[PDB]
Symmetry: C3
Subunit: 388 residues, 3 copies
C-alpha cells in the first residue's frame, strides 16, 4: 500500500504543478505589485477563458489516454517514454527559469504582456500531448513488418502484422497474442514423444552415410506401427466423446427435470445452481474423467472448475454442446485458471539490442518454463499494382 | 424523407453557424462603426489568412471524420458524444455572450484587439476536435481487456481484444464481429438434439445418488449408438459431396462447351450468363438438393440465390471448387441474403449498468431470437519480461 | 543510386526550407535594418523559445510518421497525398508572397509585430500535420464495410473489416493480408482437376434439357469413383506422414547423439549446425521426398531450404514436431522463398473508377499470373440494441 501511494504521489504532484503553472503565472503579478498595474482592457479577459477551456481539454485528454494502470514491465528503458518525460521536464524548467529571471527581477513585464505568454504554454503543451500519441500509438498503425511465431514444443505457427516497433514491444505484442491465439501447452505429448524416442537410444564418413542410408531404407519397408495405433487412439477418443455427449445430455435432462420440479415448490424463487451442480456432477463424472484421461486433459480441468462451469451454464441456460466443447479440445490459455499461466518467467533472447527497431531478417526468442517461441521478422514486399 | 431532412438540418445549421462565427466576429466591427476605426496595420491581414487556413483544415477534418452515416443505435445515452456536444454548446454560447456583452455594449474593443481573439477560437475549437478522436478512437487502441464470446446454441467460441470501452460498445463490437466470424446459426442441429433427448423423457438423497450412479455405470457399458450412426452420416455426406463435385465439374464442362459454341456465332458479343445458368442448373439441381438435404442447408440456399451465384461465377470464370465450397459447409452470416440475419431484436443483459466501463470478471449476455451469446471479460495479466 | 538521391533531394530540400522558414522570418529583419529597430521588450524572447519547441515537436513527428520508405505503388494518383502536398505548397507560397510584398517593400513591420506572425506558422503547419493523420490513418479506424475475398482457383474465402477507403487502398489491404492469410496457390490440384475433366470432353430446347436431366439421373446411380480413390489417397498420405514422423524422430535422435559426442571433444565450442544438417539430411531425405511427392509440395520445398530450416531448428533446439509441421501442410505465402511470390503482376479490375470510395454492392477483381481474387464489398447492417 505504501509503495503504491509513493509511486502515485510522484506522478500526481508533478502533473498538478504543471497544470497549475499557468494559474500561478496569471495570479502572481496581481499579488506581487498592486499600484503598478497597467490597464489590461479586454484581451486578458478573452484569453483567460480560452486558457481555461484549453486546460479542461488537456485534463480530459490526460485522464482518457494516460490515467491508466501499467500493463507490462519493460526489461530495458523505454525510449519514447523517457524522451517524452525529459522533454516535459525541460519544457517546464526552462519556462520556470525564464519567468523567475526575466520577469521577477525587474518592475516590468506588464500584465497584458504575460497573458499572451500564458496561453503560449497550453498551446505548446497540448502539442506535446499530440506528440505522445504519435510516438506510442500512431507509429504502429501502418502494417510494415510481418512476425511469424512458432512454438518450439508443439510447433504451433501464427502470423501477425506489426508496424515500426522495438524488439521488446514486438515481443510483448507476441506474448499478449499468445494467450488468446495459441493452443495451451501440453507436456503430455512431449512425454509421449520422449518415451517413443527413448526406445532407439535404449536399443543402442562415407561408409557411415551408406550404412545409415541402408538402415533408413530398411526401416521404410518395416511395419508402420504409428498409423494403426493412432487410428485406434482416434477411434477410442471418438467413442468416449460420444459416451460423454450422451452422459451430458442425460445430465441436462435431469437438470431440466429438477428445475421443473422446483418450479411448483415456490414461484418466483429460482433455486441456487450450486446444489444442482452438486447433485448432477456424479452422473457425468465417470464419463468426463475417462474423456480427460484419454485426451490427457485431466491436469488442466479441476473438479471445482467443472462445477463452476456447470453452474455458469445453468445460470445462462446453455445447450449441452456448449458445455461439452470447452472440454472437447484444448484451446486458448485464458480459458483455464489464472495459476495455469505464468507471466513472470518470460525472457527475451536476441543478438541485436532490444532497443533497436524491427528490421527484415531479424529473429528472436521468447523463453519460458520448458518452452520457447521463435519469432521471425520479415518485410512486406513492394506490391506494384497496375490498371490492366 | 421529411425525418431525414429534419435530422440533417439540426446538424447542418449549427455546424454552419459555429464555422461562420469567426467570420461574423471579424465582419461585425466594420459594419457597426465606420468613422471610429483605428489603424489596423498588418497583424490583422496576417491573422486573417491563418484563420482562413485553420477554418479550411477544420472543415476538411469534420468532413473526413464526422460527416458519415450512423451505423448502430445505442440503447442508452452515449457519454462521450453527450459530453462533446455539451462542451461545444458551452464553448459557443459563452463566447457569444462575451462578445455581446463586453464588446457590443461600448464604443471600445479596437479591431486589432479582436482579430487575435478570433484566432483564439479556431485554435481552441480544433483542440476540441483533437479531443474527439481521443475519447472515441484513441481510447480503445490499447489492448487492455480480452472478451470471450460463446454461443448458447452451438457453443461456438471466439476471442477478441478490446480497450477501455463501455459495456454497450463492447457488445456492439461483439455483434459486428459475430457476422463475419461466427458460423451461421442452424436450428436443425438443435431440433435433432431435442428429438434425441426427448426419448429419455418419453421413457419415464444418498440413495438417489447411488441409483443414478449405478444407472450411469450401466449406461457406460451399453451400446454406443451415437458413434456408428455418426460414422454412417459422415460416409453418406462424403459420398454425396463427391457426387456433387462430379456433377458441378460436368456442369462447368457444359458451360465451357456452350461458351465455345456461342463464340463462333458472334465475335466480340459475349452471351448473358443468365440463360446459361438457366440451362445448366437442372443438370446439378438433383445433386445440390441431395447435398443440402443431407447437410440441412436447404433453408439458407435458395434457387434464385444459387442461380445468382452461378451467374456471378460465370462472369468471373471461377473454378468449380470455388462454387462448390460456398455450399460445402456453413460459414459466416454475411454470405447469405439480408433477410437471413436480424439486427433489431438484439438485447443486452447485464447486472451492471451499460454506461460503466469494462472491468475484470464482468459477464454479459447478448440476446436474440432463439439464441444468446455469453461474453466474458478478463484482464490481461501483468507480463514481466527480463533479459535472461 | 543516382535515382534514389535525386528522389531524396526533392523531399529533403523542401522540408528543410519549410522548416527553416520561421528562422528566416525572425532573422531577416535584424539583417535588413539595424538603426531602425524598435524596443522588442520580452514578448519576442518568450515567443522564440515556444517557436523552437514547436519546431522540435514538428521535427519529431515528421521523423516518426513520415520518414519511412514507400511500401506499395499506386497505379493512379493518390487523392489524399496530392491534396496534402498542394495544401502545403499553397500554405508556403502564400506566406512567402505576403512576407515579400507587405513587409519587405516598406520601412515598417516592427519586430514585435513579426514574431507573433512567426508563431502563427508553426501553430498552423502542425495543424496540417494533425490533418495528415486524419485523412490517412484516422479515417479507416471505424469498421464501416466488410470485404469478402474469394480465390478463383481453389476457392479460399476470407473476410476482413475496413473503413472508408478507396478501391486501390482496399485492394492493397486485401493483397497484404493475402500473403499472411491465404494458403499458397498450388497448380497441381488445378492440373489434376483439368485431367479429370478432360475425360468427358475426350469421350464426346426442352428435349435437350430432358436428355441432360436423364443423363444426370443415370450418372447419380453410377459408381462413386471419387470417394474410394480419395480415401485411398488419404490413407497413403497418413501412412507416409507417419513414416516421415518416425524418420524425423530418428534423425533428431542422431542429432542429439552427435551433439553429445561433440561435447566431450571440446567444451564451450559448439559445432556449426551446417555439417550436422548435411550429415543428417540423407537419413530422412527419402521419406521427405516421398511425402512431398504424395502431397505435391516438392516444387516449393528445395533441398537448400530444407537444410537451412534444419540448421535453424538445430540452433533453436526445436522439437521434431515443429520441423515436421512446416512441410506437413501448405500454409502462408511468406513461409517460402522470396522468388515464390510475385508482387509486380498484380492488376485491378473494376467497372467503377478506382478513385471512388467503397460502396455497398461493389465488386472488384485482383488479377495475377494464372489466378484472380474476387472481392465483394458489403455494408454492415444497422444494429439496434435495446435494454430488454
Ligand atoms: C532536446 C531533448 C529532446 C533531448 C532528449 C534526450 C534524448 C536525445 C535521449 C534521451 C533518452 C535517450 C535514449 C535512451 C536509451 C537508448 C538506448 C541505447 O541503446 C544502446 O546503447 C544499445 C544499442 C546500440 O548499440 O546502439 C541507444 C540510445 C538510446 C536510444 C538513447 C538515445 C538518446 C535519447 C533518446
Ligand atoms: C535544431 C534542433 C531543433 C535539432 C533537434 C534535433 C532532433 C530532431 C533530434 C536530436 C536527438 C534525436 C533523437 C535521438 C535518439 C533517438 C532514439 C532513437 O531510438 C531508436 O533508434 C529506437 C526506436 C526506433 O526504432 O525508432 C530514435 C530517434 C531518436 C528519438 C532521435 C529523434 C530525433 C532527435 C530528437
Ligand atoms: C464543464 C462541462 C465539461 C460539463 C459537461 C457535463 C458532464 C459532467 C456530464 C454530461 C453528461 C453526463 C453523463 C450522462 C450519463 C451518465 C450515465 C449515468 O449512469 C447511471 O446513472 C447508472 C450507473 C451508475 O449507477 O453510476 C452515470 C453518469 C453519466 C456518465 C453522466 C456523468 C456526467 C456527464 C458526463
Ligand atoms: C478546475 C476545472 C478545470 C475542473 C474540471 C473537472 C473535470 C476534469 C471533470 C469534471 C467532470 C468530469 C467528468 C464527469 C463524468 C464523466 C463520465 C464518466 O463515464 C464513465 O465513468 C464511463 C466511461 C468510462 O468507462 O470511462 C467518465 C469520466 C467523465 C467524462 C468525467 C471526466 C472528468 C471531468 C470532465
Ligand atoms: C484550396 C485547396 C485545398 C485545393 C486543393 C485541390 C483539390 C480541390 C484537388 C487536388 C487533387 C484533386 C483530385 C485529383 C484526382 C481526382 C480523381 C478524379 O477521378 C476521375 O476523374 C474519375 C472518377 C469520376 O468519374 O469522377 C476525380 C477528382 C479527383 C478526386 C480530384 C478532386 C479535386 C482535388 C482533391
Ligand atoms: C470557403 C472555403 C473555406 C470553402 C472550402 C471548400 C472545401 C471544404 C472543399 C473544396 C474542395 C473539396 C475537395 C474536392 C475533392 C475532394 C476529393 C474527394 O475524393 C473522393 O471522392 C475519393 C475519396 C473518398 O472516398 O472520400 C473527396 C473530397 C475532397 C477531398 C473535397 C473535400 C472538401 C473540399 C476541400
Amino acid at each position: 500500500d505504501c509503495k503504491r501511494y509513493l509511486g502515485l504521489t510522484v506522478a500526481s504532484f508533478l502533473g498538478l504543478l504543471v497544470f497549475l503553472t499557468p494559474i500561478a503565472f496569471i495570479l502572481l503579478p496581481p499579488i506581487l505589485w498592486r499600484d503598478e498595474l497597467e490597464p489590461c482592457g479586454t484581451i486578458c479577459e478573452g484569453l483567460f477563458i480560452s486558457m481555461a477551456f484549453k486546460l479542461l481539454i488537456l485534463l480530459i485528454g490526460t485522464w482518457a489516454l494516460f490515467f491508466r494502470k501499467r500493463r507490462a514491465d519493460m526489461p530495458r528503458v523505454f525510449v519514447f517514454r523517457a524522451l517524452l518525460l525529459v522533454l516535459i521536464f525541460l519544457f517546464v524548467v526552462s519556462y520556470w527559469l525564464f519567468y523567475g529571471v526575466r520577469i521577477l527581477d525587474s518592475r516590468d513585464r506588464n500584465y497584458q504582456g504575460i497573458v499572451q505568454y500564458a496561453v503560449s504554454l497550453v498551446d505548446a503543451l497540448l502539442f506535446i500531448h499530440y506528440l505522445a500519441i504519435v510516438l506510442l500509438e500512431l507509429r504502429q498503425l501502418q502494417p510494415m513488418f510481418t512476425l511469424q511465431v512458432v512454438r518450439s514444443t508443439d510447433g504451433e505457427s501464427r502470423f501477425y502484422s506489426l508496424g515500426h516497433l522495438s524488439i521488446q514491444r514486438a515481443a510483448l505484442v507476441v506474448l499478449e497474442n499468445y494467450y488468446k491465439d495459441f493452443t495451451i501447452y501440453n507436456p503430455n505429448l512431449l512425454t509421449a514423444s520422449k518415451f517413443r524416442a527413448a526406445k532407439h537410444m535404449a536399443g543402442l564418413t562415407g561408409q557411415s552415410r551408406a550404412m545409415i542410408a541402408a538402415a533408413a531404407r530398411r526401416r521404410d519397408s518395416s511395419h508402420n506401427e504409428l498409423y494403426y495405433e493412432e487410428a485406434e487412439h482416434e477411434r477410442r477418443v471418438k467413442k468416449r466423446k460420444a459416451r460423454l455427449v450422451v452422459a451430458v445430455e442425460e445430465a441436462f435432462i435431469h437438470i431440466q427435470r429438477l428445475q421443473a420440479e422446483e418450479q411448483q415448490k415456490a414461484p418466483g424463487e429460482v433455486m441456487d445452481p450450486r446444489e444442482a451442480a452438486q447433485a448432477i456432477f456424479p452422473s457425468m463424472a465417470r464419463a468426463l474423467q475417462k474423456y480427460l484421461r484419454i485426451t490427457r486433459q485431466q491436469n488442466y480441468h479441476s473438479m471445482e472448475s467443472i462445477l463452476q462451469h456447470l453452474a455458469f451454464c445453468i445460470t445462462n441456460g446453455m445447450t449441452p454442446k456448449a458445455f461439452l466443447e470447452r472440454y472437447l479440445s484444448a484451446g486458448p490459455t485464458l480459458q483455464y485458471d489464472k495459476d495455469r499461466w505464468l507471466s513472470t518467467q518470460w525472457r527475451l533472447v536476441s543478438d541485436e539490442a532490444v532497443t533497436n527497431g524491427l528490421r527484415d531478417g531479424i529473429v528472436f526468442v521468447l523463453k519460458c518454463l520448458d518452452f520457447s517461441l521463435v519469432v521471425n521478422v520479415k518485410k512486406i514486399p513492394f506490391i506494384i499494382l497496375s490498371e490492366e
